[PDB]
Amino acid sequence: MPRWKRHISEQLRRRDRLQRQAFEEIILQYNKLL
Amino acid sequence: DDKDVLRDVWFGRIPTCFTLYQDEITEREAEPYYLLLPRVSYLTLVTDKVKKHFQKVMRQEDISEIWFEYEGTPLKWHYPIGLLFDLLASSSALPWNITVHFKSFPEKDLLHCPSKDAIEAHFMSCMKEADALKHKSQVINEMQKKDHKQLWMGLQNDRFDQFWAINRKLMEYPAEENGFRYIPFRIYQTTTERPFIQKLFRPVAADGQLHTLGDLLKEVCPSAIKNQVMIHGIEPMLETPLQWLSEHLSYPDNFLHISIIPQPT
Amino acid sequence: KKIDILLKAVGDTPIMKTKKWAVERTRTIQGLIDFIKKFLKLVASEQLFIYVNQSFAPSPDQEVGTLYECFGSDGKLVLHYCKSQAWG
Numbered sequence: 001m002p003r004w005k006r007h008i009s010e011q012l013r014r015r016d017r018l019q020r021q022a023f024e025e026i027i028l029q030y031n032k033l034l
Numbered sequence: 035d036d037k038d039v040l041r042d043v044w045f046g047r048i049p050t051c052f053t054l055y056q057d058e059i060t061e062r063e064a065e066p067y068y069l070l071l072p073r074v075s076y077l078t079l080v081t082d083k084v085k086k087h088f089q090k091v092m093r094q095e096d097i098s099e100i101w102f103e104y105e106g107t108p109l110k111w112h113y114p115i116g117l118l119f120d121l122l123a124s125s126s127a128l129p130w131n132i133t134v135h136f137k138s139f140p141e142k143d144l145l146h147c148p149s150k151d152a153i154e155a156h157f158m159s160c161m162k163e164a165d166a167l168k169h170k171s172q173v174i175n176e177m178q179k180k181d182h183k184q185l186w187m188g189l190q191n192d193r194f195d196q197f198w199a200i201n202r203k204l205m206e207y208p209a210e211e212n213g214f215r216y217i218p219f220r221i222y223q224t225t226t227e228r229p230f231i232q233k234l235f236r237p238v239a240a241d242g243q244l245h246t247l248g249d250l251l252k253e254v255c256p257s258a259i260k261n262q263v264m265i266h267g268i269e270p271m272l273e274t275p276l277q278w279l280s281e282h283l284s285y286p287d288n289f290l291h292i293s294i295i296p297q298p299t
Numbered sequence: 300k301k302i303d304i305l306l307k308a309v310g311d312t313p314i315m316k317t318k319k320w321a322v323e324r325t326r327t328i329q330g331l332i333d334f335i336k337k338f339l340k341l342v343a344s345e346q347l348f349i350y351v352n353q354s355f356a357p358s359p360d361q362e363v364g365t366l367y368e369c370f371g372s373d374g375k376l377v378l379h380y381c382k383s384q385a386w387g
């Protein structure tokens with residue numbers, strides 16, 4: 001796999017971990033007690 | 035392989051805090067609504083639950099066409115959610131703080147969104163404009179009306195396989211060539227008076243070499259090489275093949291929306 | 300600078316007498332639509348679609364100078380107006 005393609009894959013996964021995964025559970029929890 | 039990149043881009047979410055616009059005098063302060071907004075979608079398409087949420091604490095006479103804003107900046111509903119964040123709020127503390135309004139619609143900054151048919155129209159308009167650059171609109175116009183409906187339904191229902199079952203045709207090119215005729219891209223920049231930069235650019239050089247993201251910028255936006263080149267929340271290497279980017283890192287509207295923002299702290 | 304626009308018709312719709320116009324690059328499709336509705340005696344409620352390359356309808360907030368650089372021909376941007384959806 002090319003260098004640039006490996007970078008993007010790692011970046012997209014890093015993005016999800018920092019953005020989506022960080023909030024997905026607590027948002028789901030909060031929505032229930034509303 | 036490459037399919038993994040497509041899935042990550044597609045299902046990309048953004049933690050967003052919808053706060054109703056109020057003052058320190060209102061009878062009751064409404065509860066803020068948290069939601070993961072799909073990057074590749076639009077505000078007026080995935081905000082029915084937030085509309086129902088706040089319409090409960092308002093009169094029937096006080097409700098109108100809802101509209102969102104960030105830091106006093108009205109949010110264009112025809113811009114993809116991912117693009118707005120990358121350009122406006124990416125270097126601020128999550129979740130994305132969006133203020134919710136109903137009165138005082140800024141008609142000089144926002145286009146009205148009367149229906150989801152209006153959205154579907156704009157979306158189809160972008161795709162045809164994109165394929166006009168890639169294949170002279172020879173691919174999308176030769177599709178059935180059901181194929182156009184499937185592309186829209188796949189985006190609205192968050193169905194990856196359903197959407198890409200048709201979109202795969204809009205990402206292929208004649209065998210004799212090594213890419214599209216022109217790349218559907220739009221370069222945004224808060225500092226420039228222009229809405230975005232969109233010019234004709236061929237993905238292949240004369241000798242046959244593939245043009246890179248650096249080559250694109252060097253040609254159409256050389257005044258950005260200190261700043262971040264952010265696409266879908268990430269900062270790809272400038273050596274990345276532009277042709278490959280258009281195939282994998284494009285939005286469902288087949289456009290390559292690119293943000294040029296200043297470096298953070 | 301400025302760009303030249305050629306307006307073409309798709310009936311049934313009133314025909315522009317002056318089709319060749321010199322326009323700004325910063326003017327948008329909407330302000331162009333508003334200009335056309337006046338000559339065609341069309342009101343605000345009446346819808347009016349504009350097309351490029353006889354295929355798609357660009358957004359109302361989209362500039363013409365940009366569309367010219369992308370889809371222009373022979374130094375001018377050909378546009379098509381109609382009172383109904385011509386091409387999907």
Ligand code: NA
Nearest residue numbers: 127128129131
């Ligand atoms: Na915030």
